[PDB]
Amino acid sequence: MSDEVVLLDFWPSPFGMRVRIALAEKGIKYEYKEEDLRNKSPLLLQMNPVHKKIPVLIHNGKPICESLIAVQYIEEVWNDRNPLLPSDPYQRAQTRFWADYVDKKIYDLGRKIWTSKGEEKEAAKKEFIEALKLLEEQLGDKTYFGGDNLGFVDIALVPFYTWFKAYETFGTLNIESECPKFIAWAKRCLQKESVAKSLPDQQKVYEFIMDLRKKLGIE
Amino acid sequence: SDEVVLLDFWPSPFGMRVRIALAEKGIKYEYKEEDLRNKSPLLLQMNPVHKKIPVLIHNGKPICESLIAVQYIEEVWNDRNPLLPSDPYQRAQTRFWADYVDKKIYDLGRKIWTSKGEEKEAAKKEFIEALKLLEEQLGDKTYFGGDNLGFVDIALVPFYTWFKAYETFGTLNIESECPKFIAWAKRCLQKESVAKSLPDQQKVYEFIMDLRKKLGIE
Numbered sequence: 001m002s003d004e005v006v007l008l009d010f011w012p013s014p015f016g017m018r019v020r021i022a023l024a025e026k027g028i029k030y031e032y033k034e035e036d037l038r039n040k041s042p043l044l045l046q047m048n049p050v051h052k053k054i055p056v057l058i059h060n061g062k063p064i065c066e067s068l069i070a071v072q073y074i075e076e077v078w079n080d081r082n083p084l085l086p087s088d089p090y091q092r093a094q095t096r097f098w099a100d101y102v103d104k105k106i107y108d109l110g111r112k113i114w115t116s117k118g119e120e121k122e123a124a125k126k127e128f129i130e131a132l133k134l135l136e137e138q139l140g141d142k143t144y145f146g147g148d149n150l151g152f153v154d155i156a157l158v159p160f161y162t163w164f165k166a167y168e169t170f171g172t173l174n175i176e177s178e179c180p181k182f183i184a185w186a187k188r189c190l191q192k193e194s195v196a197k198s199l200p201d202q203q204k205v206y207e208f209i210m211d212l213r214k215k216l217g218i219e
Numbered sequence: 220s221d222e223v224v225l226l227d228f229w230p231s232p233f234g235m236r237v238r239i240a241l242a243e244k245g246i247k248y249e250y251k252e253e254d255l256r257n258k259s260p261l262l263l264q265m266n267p268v269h270k271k272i273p274v275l276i277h278n279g280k281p282i283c284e285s286l287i288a289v290q291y292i293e294e295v296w297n298d299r300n301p302l303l304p305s306d307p308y309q310r311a312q313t314r315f316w317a318d319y320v321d322k323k324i325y326d327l328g329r330k331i332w333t334s335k336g337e338e339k340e341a342a343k344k345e346f347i348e349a350l351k352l353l354e355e356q357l358g359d360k361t362y363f364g365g366d367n368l369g370f371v372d373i374a375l376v377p378f379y380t381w382f383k384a385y386e387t388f389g390t391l392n393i394e395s396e397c398p399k400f401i402a403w404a405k406r407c408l409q410k411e412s413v414a415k416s417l418p419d420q421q422k423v424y425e426f427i428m429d430l431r432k433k434l435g436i437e
């Protein structure tokens with residue numbers, strides 16, 4: 001346990017939650033540090049000069065930025081137990097692909113859903129559900145995306161669950177009707193301690209988004 | 220006796236990445252040109268979710284997204300010519316800067332030759348900032364990879380072939396702002412793996428000019 005591990009994060013961030021899940025799942029004890037992104041710390045600005053974003057994993061004093069890159073780092077350094085990625089190069093390529101798909105789609109469509117109006121919002125909604133269906137489809141059978149254990153794609157994707165209430169309310173939308181197997185999988189993930197301890201409740205996230213929409217618009 | 224096929228489109232920076240990576244590893248492969256305005260049935264089957272090139276098809280199985288396909292190449296032909304560092308922290312950083320390229324270069328690039336106002340002026344600003352950031356992250360080591368071509372060189376140098384177009388349409392001069400950058404690009408172009416893979420800037424400019432007019436852009 002001699003290693004020093006610090007996580008710069010902000011509690012409702014799905015990207016931060018990824019790293020939270022990955023550390024828990026590996027059994028890595030760490031110091032969590034909360035950032036106020038409207039007043040970023042000098043430490044965060046020094047550790048992430050390029051993007052000035054969280055999460056930032058700091059390991060023995062050295063920063064690793066971009067959540068999924070941090071998750072692969074965690075995987076490659078603490079690789080003695082609990083593989084979060086397949087060892088077959090082709091299967092690994094594919095879990096990289098779907099994790100990447102999550103990065104491309106979910107947060108951005110998501111943000112469009114709760115910020116935009118009219119057809120822009122209407123289009124964001126359709127794409128959002130297609131994206132989830134594709135993911136749902138790739139899950140198919142399997143307990144988790146990673147097969148029998150939590151994997152890279154579960155880690156990448158399940159934090160967004162905590163944002164679903166906000167999507168649904170501001171989006172005028174219902175994911176469980178459209179993608180029942182999806183919501184089932186999320187719920188299975190929430191039974192794993194590494195996930196439950198890492199994710200905030202949808203309600204707290206909703207309120208966060210609500211305070212954030214008012215500080216912007218439309219309502 | 221591996222079968223290797225590359226679905227690609229000649230002026231694609233993303234395709235060039237895979238082109239360079241295969242050359243570096245000495246992998247013999249079949250190149251296959253796609254008309255992105257009439258995508259083949261094969262491409263639609265191999266890349267159903269994004270419907271884009273490049274697609275690396277290895278023993279019949281597809282790998283989509285260029286830098287993912289480069290890591291695949293690296294991990295499978297791991298026998299020699301390492302394209303990524305072996306150290307986890309260094310590999311993380313290499314991944315970070317390749318990601319940085321993916322985030323910035325192509326998109327600012329497109330804004331530069333499509334957008335109009337001080338949107339264009341903004342794009343031009345960010346574009347040069349990005350090149351600067353990459354520049355100072357470059358040594359001088361000979362390459363981003365150190366003494367050899369690495370992941371970030373592969374990720375980045377294809378966009379060189381787009382520089383003439385960026386400059387002529389952006390009203391811009393990269394070698395002014397970033398001479399160390401342009402010098403590196405030129406060192407890269409001396410590697411034969413880079414040279415076979417990249418078309419000429421003129422060829423690309425002409426592509427973008429015909430593409431630019433067949434868009435509504437004046």
Ligand SMILES: N[C@@H](CCC(=O)N[C@@H](CS)C(=O)NCC(=O)O)C(=O)O
Pocket residue numbers: 010012013014015037052053054055065066067068
């Ligand atoms: N690509 C990044 C995205 C991280 C991100 O967007 N973090 C947000 C919080 S949800 C942030 O730090 N925004 C900071 C600022 O631009 O306000 C991840 O995978 O690490």
Ligand SMILES: N[C@@H](CCC(=O)N[C@@H](CS)C(=O)NCC(=O)O)C(=O)O
Pocket residue numbers: 228230231232233255270271272273283284285286
């Ligand atoms: N993220 C992708 C982007 C690839 C991409 O954008 N390829 C282009 C050519 S420049 C394409 O296929 N565009 C297809 C479109 O016309 O639908 C890469 O790393 O593989």
